[PDB]
C-alpha cells in the first residue's frame, strides 16, 4: 500500500541542522523516499534557503531518476516486454501483470520525459515518486527472465522483494540487503558438501577432475550462526524463504551456482543509484576513523621550514610496511632516475578532461577560440605554458579549492571523487612515477585487465583447484575514507626514500640545489644536496590539502572535512596498491622475525581489492589469516571480512571450485548516466554490441539474450533525428522515402529548421558497417535457410558474408558467378540499408566540426606545448609519419606522436557542440551526398571480395572431443558451459586456450594504457603488422613515429613475429576476448576440424587464410553442430583472387 497509495511529503524525511549549513548529520533516508508525486510543491518565495531545497529535491524526482541508455524510458520497457512475448510465445507470463498493476491509468502513460526540456514531466500527480526507477527494475528482471537466470515463478519472488524495498526508501533498503543477500552461498557450498570439480594446470589448460569436499572449516561455521540471524530479520520473508530452500535443496556445486546468480539478480536492478550529491557527501567521502590511530615517523631531515624531508618508522604498523618496502629504494632510484620526467608529463597530461578553473578575466586575454577550448588538461596547460617553470605556479593553486566530481557505480552508493587542476595534479605526479615501478619489480603488485578473457582469472582458477588451501579476499571498506593523513604517510616514506638515492635534475619548476637541511641529532643546519624529485616530493608531502569543495544550488559551498584520500590525484591506484602490498608482505617478515612461519602463497593486490592465498594445515593458515586481518585492523582500516575454503573474488569476478561465476547483473543494459560520448548513431549500436558481449558467459541461455538484444536493437535503436533546412527538407524526404520510410515532422515557426527522423530499417541492424549484430536464419530462393548466427559470431567484414549467404553460396559455385541477387536483398530491404551506410552521416558531422576551427590558432597553441617537453625532435616523429606515407602508404592519425599532440587538443572542439549554425551546413552537405547516391543504387561489390563465397559441407564421420571436455563435463565451468550446451561444446570441439598468444598481447598493452577489455583492434598493432608482414623494410622509420623506445620496440616485434602464423590482413574480422573467454584465440585449433583437399592450397598465405574460414563458421554455426566434421568447397574465383 506504500506504492498503490503513497503517503504525503513528511518534511522530517530530509531535515536540516539548526542552521541551514548542511543536512542533519546521522540522518537516514538519504535517497529518494517514495512519497507520491503531488505533495512536493513550492509555497514561499525564491530565497530563504529551504526554497532551493524543494527546488533541488524536484531535480531529484524529475531529473535524476531517468537514465535511459538508448531510447526514451517507455521504448526500453517495451523492448523486454515485446521480446518476452516472442520468446515464450504467450502472454501468460507474470511480468506484464507487474507492468499493469504498478502503473495503469487508462488514457496515457503516468509519466514521460521531454527530451528537449530535460525533465520527467508527470501526467498523474497521485502516482508514486519512485516509479521511474521501477521501469528499470521491470526492465532488468525481464532481462534476467530472458537470460535464463530467473524463471517466471522466480521473478515473482524477485519483484515482490523489490516492491517491499520501496515501502520507505527504495535504495536505502536495498543497500542493507546488498550485503546479506549474497553472502549465503558459503553455507550452501558447505551443505553440498562433496562436489566434483575440474582442476587446472600452471599454464591454464584443464588437466584433471577430482571430487573435493567443500566443507568449509570449523571457524567459518561459527560465522554461519551470526550471519543467519541477520538473514532472518533484515529480509523479506518470501525472499528469505527462497534462500532457505537453496541451502537445503542444493545437491551439486552446479546447483548452488543456479541459485546464486538468481538470488543476486533479486537484490539488484542495475539502476545507477543517483541522488543529489549533497545527500551523499556525508555517506561516501566523509572520513571515518576505524580503530586505531596511526602514529608518526621519526623525522630525520627537515629543510629551512620544519617539515618532513627524510623519515623512518619506529615499531608501529608502518615499520612492518617499511621492512618490506625500503629494500626497493636502491633499485627504483635507477628506474625513476632513468625516465626523463618532463617528457612523461605531457604523456600523462593527455586524456583531455577538466582543469578546475573557469579560466577567468584572462579567458578574454587569451582569445575567444581558446576560451571555448578551455576545459581540457592539455589545453589549460597550453594557455599557461609560460608559467610551467616558475615555482609560484604551484603556490597559486593551493589557493584554488578542489571541486567534487561525482560518479556512481552499479551497486555502490553515490560516490564522489576529486577533480584536481593541473598544479595539484603536478605535486602528486612524482609519487605516481615512483610508485609505478614497483609493478614491474614485484609480481603480486598485480593484474591489469588487458586480457579480458581467462588470463585475468587464470591465477584464481588455478589455486582454487588445489588442496589444503584457504582463500581470503579482502575489501576494506571505505578505503577513500580510511587513509587518514597519518595512514597516507606510510606511502610518503616510500616515495621519499626512493627520491634521495635518485638523481633527477629539474623535474619541472625546480632544480637540484643547495638547501639548508636540519639533521635531527644535529644542532645546526647542514646543507645537503637535494635533487628536484626530492624537493617536489617534500613539498607535496608537506603541503597536503585534502578537502573537496562542492558548490551547491541549495547551500553556498559545502566542503568535505578533510583527511580522506582525494581519489583523483595521480596516484589513486598506486597509493592503495603500494600501501597494502607493504602491509601484507611486510607481515610475513615480521612473523618470520619472531619464530612463526609465513605459509602464504601468491597475493594479488589491485587497490583496494586484496586477495591472498594460503597453504598448510587448517590451523597454521588461520594463525596467519588473523594477523593479516589484525594488522589491517590496527592500520586504521575496516576490512569487511571475507574468507573461505573454495571461494575467491577479485575485480568483481568470482572464481570458485575451479569454475567461473558470472555477476551478470552488474552489466546493466539500460542505464548509463555518463553525460559524455552519448550515441544515437552507429556508435549507439556499438554500445549494445560491447555490452551484449559482456554477458555471454554470465548467462544461462545466450540464445535468449540474442533475442533480447535484437528487439531492443529493433524497437529502441531505430530512429535517427536530423535537423535539415526547409528548401532541402522537401527533397530529403522524397529521395529517402524511395527506399525506407522516413518520418516527417510538423512544420516550424520561427526556428527555420523542421525536424525529421529517418527510420533505419531492420537490415541496417545486420550490416557490416551499421549494426554489426548477429542475425537469425533468413530465406534463400527455394528457400533452404541460412545458419542461425550464434553469440560467438565475429563482426567486421564477416557480416558482409551474410549478404552473400542469403544468395545461396553453394548455388553460386555451381554456376561459376560472382553475380548477386538484387531481388532478394531489395525484398527484405538490405539494399535500403547499405545506402544509409554510404551516406556516411557520422564523420560528416565530424567533418563540419573539423571544418570549423582555424588550424592557425591550434598550431600556435600546440607549438607552445612541445616547448614544455622533449625539448626538440618531437619534430622527428612528424617527419617520420610524413616520410612513411609519401614513400609508401597511409599510417593514420591517432597513433603517431605529434599528430597525437594535435589530436589531443582537438577533442574540445569535438566537445563544445553541434549547434545550430554548424547544423545548417550539415544538411547542405548531406543532401548533396543524398541526391548523388539515390539517383541510382545497386549493391556495390568490390574486387577485394571474391573472398567469401566458401561453404562447408557436412559429412557422416564425427570429431574427437578433446579429453579436457570430459573434465569440464561436470560441473558448470562457466554459466553457459553447462553440459550439452553451445558454449560447452564449442569449448569441447573448437577447444583450448593457448597461453602463447595473449601473453604477448598482455605484454603489448603494458606500453599503452592498460586497465580493461582491450579488445583486439589496438590501432598501433594492426597498422604496424600490415607494414611488418607484407612490406617491412620501412619498419625502422615508423617506430620513431611512435617514439617507441628500444624496450618498447622489443615488445611489439615479438608479437608481430608470433602473429605471422595466423592470419590474414586481407580478410578482416573482429571479435573481443570478452566475447569468447575460454574459447581459443587461434584459428590453428579449427584446422583440426575441417579437411581441405590440398589442390586448394594455392598461395603463400593461403594455408593461413583457410584457417579463419574454418575458425569462424564453427563459431558462427555452433547451434547447428552435431559434432560432424565439415569440409570446405570454394568458388574458383576465390581460388583465382588469392593468386596475387
Amino acid at each position: 500500500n506504500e506504492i498503490i497509495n503513497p503517503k504525503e511529503y513528511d518534511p522530517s524525511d530530509y531535515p536540516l541542522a539548526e542552521d541551514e549549513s548542511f543536512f542533519k548529520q546521522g540522518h537516514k533516508y538519504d535517497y529518494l523516499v517514495t512519497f507520491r508525486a503531488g505533495s512536493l510543491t513550492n509555497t514561499y518565495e525564491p530565497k530563504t534557503k529551504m526554497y532551493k531545497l524543494h527546488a533541488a529535491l524536484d531535480k531529484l524526482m524529475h531529473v535524476k531518476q531517468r537514465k535511459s541508455r538508448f531510447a526514451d524510458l517507455w521504448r526500453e520497457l517495451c523492448a523486454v516486454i515485446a521480446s518476452l512475448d516472442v520468446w515464450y510465445q504467450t502472454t501468460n507470463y507474470p511480468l506484464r501483470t507487474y507492468v499493469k498493476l504498478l502503473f495503469h491509468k487508462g488514457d496515457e502513460f503516468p509519466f514521460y520525459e521531454s527530451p528537449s526540456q530535460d525533465r520527467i514531466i508527470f501526467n498523474d500527480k497521485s502516482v508514486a515518486s519512485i516509479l521511474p526507477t521501477f521501469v528499470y527494475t521491470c526492465c532488468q528482471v525481464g532481462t534476467a527472465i530472458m537470460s535464463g537466470i530467473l524463471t517466471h515463478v522466480e521473478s515473482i519472488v524477485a519483484m515482490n522483494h523489490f516492491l517491499h524495498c520501496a515501502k520507505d526508501s527504495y535504495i536505502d533498503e536495498k543497500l542493507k540487503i546488498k550485503g546479506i543477500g549474497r553472502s549465503w552461498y558459503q553455507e550452501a557450498l558447505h551443505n553440498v558438501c562433496q562436489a566434483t570439480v575440474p582442476v587446472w594446470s600452471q599454464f591454464n589448460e584443464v588437466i584433471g577432475h577430482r571430487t573435493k569436499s567443500t566443507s568449509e572449516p570449523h571457524f567459518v561455521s561459527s560465522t554461519f550462526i551470526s550471519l543467519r540471524a541477520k538473514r532472518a530479520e533484515l529480509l523479506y520473508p518470501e525472499f528469505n524463504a527462497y534462500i532457505n530452500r537453496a541451502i537445503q535443496l542444493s545437491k551439486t556445486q552446479n546447483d548452488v551456482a543456479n541459485y546464486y546468480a538468481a538470488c543476486r539478480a533479486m537484490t539488484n536492478d542495475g539502476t545507477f543509484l543517483a541522488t543529489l550529491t549533497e545527500l551523499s557527501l556525508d555517506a561516501a567521502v566523509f572520513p571515518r576513523i576505524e580503530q586505531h590511530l596511526v602514529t608518526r615517523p621519526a623525522v630525520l631531515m627537515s629543510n629551512t621550514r620544519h617539515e618532513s624531508l627524510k623519515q623512518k618508522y619506529t615499531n608501529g604498523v608502518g615499520s612492518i610496511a617499511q621492512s618490506y618496502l625500503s629494500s626497493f629504494t636502491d633499485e627504483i632510484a635507477k628506474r625513476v632516475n632513468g625516465r626523463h620526467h618532463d617528457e612523461a608529463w605531457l604523456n600523462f597530461l593527455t586524456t583531455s578532461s577538466p582543469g578546475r578553473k573557469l579560466t577567468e578575466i584572462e579567458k578574454l586575454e587569451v582569445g575567444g577560440d581558446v576560451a571555448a577550448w578551455s576545459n581540457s588538461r592539455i589545453v589549460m596547460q597550453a594557455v599557461f605554458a609560460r608559467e610551467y617553470r616558475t615555482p609560484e605556479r604551484i603556490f597559486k593553486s593551493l589557493k584554488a579549492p578542489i571541486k567534487l566530481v561525482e560518479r556512481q557505480q552499479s551497486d555502490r552508493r553515490q560516490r564522489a571523487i576529486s577533480g584536481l587542476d593541473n598544479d595539484r595534479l603536478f605535486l602528486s605526479f612524482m609519487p605516481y612515477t615512483i610508485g609505478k615501478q614497483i609493478y614491474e619489480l614485484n609480481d603480486n603488485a598485480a593484474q591489469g585487465k588487458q586480457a579480458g578473457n581467462a588470463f585475468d582469472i587464470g591465477e584464481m582458477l588455478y589455486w582454487t583447484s588445489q588442496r589444503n588451501v584457504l582463500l581470503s579476499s579482502i575489501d576494506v571498506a571505505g578505503m577513500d575514507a580510511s587513509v587518514t593523513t597519518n595512514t597516507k604517510d606510510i606511502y610518503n616514506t616510500f616515495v621519499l626514500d626512493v627520491a634521495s638515492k635518485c638523481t633527477v635534475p629539474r623535474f619541472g619548476p625546480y632544480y637540484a640545489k643547495n638547501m639548508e637541511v636540519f639533521e635531527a641529532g644535529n644542532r645546526q643546519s647542514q646543507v645537503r644536496y637535494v635533487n628536484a624529485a626530492w624537493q617536489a616530493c617534500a613539498l607535496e608531502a608537506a603541503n597536503s590539502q585534502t578537502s573537496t569543495s562542492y558548490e551547491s544550488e541549495i547551500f553556498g559551498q559545502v566542503k568535505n572535512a578533510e583527511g580522506t584520500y582525494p581519489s583523483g590525484r595521480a596516484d589513486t591506484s598506486t597509493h592503495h596498491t603500494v600501501l597494502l602490498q607493504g602491509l601484507v608482505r611486510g607481515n610475513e617478515l615480521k612473523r618470520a622475525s619472531d619464530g612463526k612461519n609465513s605459509c602464504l602463497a601468491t597475493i594479488k593486490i589491485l587497490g583496494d581489492d586484496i586477495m591472498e592465498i594460503f597453504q598448510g594445515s587448517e590451523s597454521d593458515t588461520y594463525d596467519h589469516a588473523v594477523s593479516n586481518a589484525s594488522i589491517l585492523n590496527e592500520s586504521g582500516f575496516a576490512t569487511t571480512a571475507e574468507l573461505s575454503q573454495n571461494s575467491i573474488v577479485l575485480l568483481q569476478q568470482l572464481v570458485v571450485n575451479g569454475t567461473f561465476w558470472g555477476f551478470a547483473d552488474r552489466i546493466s543494459l539500460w542505464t548509463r548516466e555518463d553525460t559524455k560520448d552519448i550515441g544515437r548513431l552507429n556508435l549507439a549500436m556499438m554500445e549494445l554490441n560491447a555490452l551484449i558481449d559482456d554477458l555471454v558467459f554470465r548467462v544461462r541461455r545466450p540464445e535468449g539474450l540474442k533475442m533480447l538484444g535484437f528487439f531492443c536493437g529493433a524497437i529502441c535503436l531505430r530512429r535517427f533525428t536530423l535537423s535539415v533546412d526547409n528548401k532541402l527538407y522537401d527533397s530529403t524526404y522524397n529521395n529517402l522515402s524511395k527506399y525506407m520510410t522516413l518520418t516527417k515532422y510538423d512544420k516550424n515557426p520561427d526556428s527555420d529548421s523542421t525536424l525529421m527522423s529517418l527510420i533505419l530499417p531492420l537490415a541496417w541492424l545486420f550490416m557490416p558497417r551499421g549494426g554489426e549484430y548477429p542475425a537469425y536464419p533468413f530465406e534463400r530462393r527455394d528457400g533452404t535457410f541460412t545458419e542461425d548466427e550464434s553469440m560467438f559470431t565475429a563482426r567486421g567484414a564477416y557480416k558482409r558474408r551474410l549478404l552473400y549467404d542469403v544468395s545461396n553460396i553453394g548455388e553460386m559455385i555451381q554456376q561459376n558467378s560472382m553475380a548477386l541477387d538484387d531481388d532478394l536483398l531489395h525484398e527484405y530491404g538490405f539494399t535500403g540499408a547499405l545506402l544509409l551506410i554510404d551516406l556516411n552521416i557520422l564523420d560528416l558531422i565530424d567533418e563540419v566540426k573539423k571544418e570549423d576551427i582555424s588550424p592557425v590558432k591550434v598550431s600556435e597553441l600546440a607549438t607552445s606545448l612541445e616547448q614544455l617537453g622533449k625539448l626538440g625532435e618531437r619534430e622527428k616523429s612528424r617527419r617520420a609519419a610524413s616520410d612513411l606515407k609519401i614513400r609508401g602508404h597511409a599510417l593514420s592519425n591517432d597513433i603517431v606522436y605529434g599528430y597525437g599532440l594535435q589530436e589531443k587538443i582537438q577533442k574540445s572542439a569535438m566537445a563544445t557542440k553541434e549547434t545550430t549554425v554548424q547544423s545548417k551546413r550539415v544538411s547542405s552537405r548531406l543532401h548533396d551526398v543524398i541526391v548523388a547516391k539515390t539517383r541510382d543504387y545497386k549493391i556495390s561489390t568490390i574486387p577485394a571480395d571474391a573472398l567469401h563465397l566458401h561453404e562447408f559441407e557436412v559429412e557422416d564421420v564425427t570429431v574427437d572431443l578433446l579429453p579436457h571436455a570430459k573434465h569440464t563435463s561436470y560441473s558448470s565451468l562457466a554459466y553457459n558451459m553447462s553440459f550439452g550446451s553451445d558454449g560447452w561444446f564449442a569449448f569441447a570441439l573448437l577447444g583450448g586456450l593457448d597461453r602463447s598468444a595473449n601473453l604477448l598481447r598482455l605484454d603489448v598493452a603494458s606500453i599503452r594504457g592498460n586497465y580493461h577489455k582491450f579488445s583486439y583492434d589496438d590501432p598501433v598493432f594492426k597498422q604496424g603488422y600490415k607494414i611488418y608482414k607484407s612490406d617491412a623494410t620501412l619498419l625502422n622509420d615508423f617506430f620513431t613515429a611512435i617514439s617507441a623506445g628500444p624496450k618498447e620496440q622489443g615488445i611489439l616485434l615479438r608479437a608481430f613475429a608470433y602473429y605471422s602464423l595466423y592470419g590474414n590482413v586481407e580478410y578482416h574480422y573482429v571479435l573481443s576476448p570478452r566475447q569468447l573467454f575460454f574459447l581459443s584465440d587461434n584459428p590453428v585449433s579449427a584446422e583440426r576440424l575441417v579437411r581441405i583437399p590440398p589442390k586448394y592450397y594455392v598461395s603463400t598465405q593461403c594455408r593461413a587464410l583457410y584457417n579463419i574460414f574454418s575458425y569462424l563458421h564453427i563459431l558462427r554455426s555452433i547451434a547447428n553442430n552435431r559434432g560432424k566434421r565439415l569440409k570446405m568447397v570454394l568458388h574458383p574465383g576465390l581460388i583465382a583472387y588469392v593468386r596475387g
Binding site: 626523463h340 638523481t503 635534475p505 625532435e873 617491412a1032 625502422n1036 620513431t1040 608481430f1056
Partner: protein, 96 residues
C-alpha cells in the same frame, strides 16, 4: 669532515657541465639497421636493452668528474646480477 669529497666533486662536476662537453640526445642507435627485428637476435637484444640505461645528463658529468677527483670514501660497484649462461651474455664483458 669526510663530506669534503662531496665538495671537490661538486666543483669538478660544475666545471664539466659548464664546458658543454657531452649533450644527451633522444635517438638510440644500439643496433644496426634491421637487426633489431630479426628473430635470431631476440636473445641478444634483451641483454643489451637490460644493461643500457637512459642517458641522464647528471651522471655522465659525474663519472667524468670522479676520474680526477680525490677518493676519500672507498668506491664500490653496483651489484650486477648476471648469469653468464647464454652466449648473448658478452654484453656485460663489453660493458667492462
Amino acid at each position: 669532515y669526510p663530506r669534503l669529497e662531496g665538495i671537490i666533486v661538486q666543483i669538478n662536476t660544475g666545471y664539466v657541465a659548464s664546458a658543454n662537453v657531452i649533450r644527451p640526445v633522444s635517438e638510440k642507435r644500439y643496433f644496426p639497421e634491421n637487426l633489431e627485428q630479426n628473430q635470431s637476435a631476440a636473445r641478444l637484444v634483451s641483454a643489451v636493452k637490460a644493461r643500457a640505461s637512459e642517458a641522464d645528463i647528471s651522471s655522465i658529468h659525474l663519472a667524468i668528474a670522479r676520474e680526477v677527483s680525490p677518493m676519500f670514501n672507498v668506491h664500490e660497484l653496483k651489484k650486477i646480477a648476471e648469469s653468464f649462461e647464454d652466449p648473448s651474455s658478452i654484453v656485460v664483458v663489453l660493458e667492462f
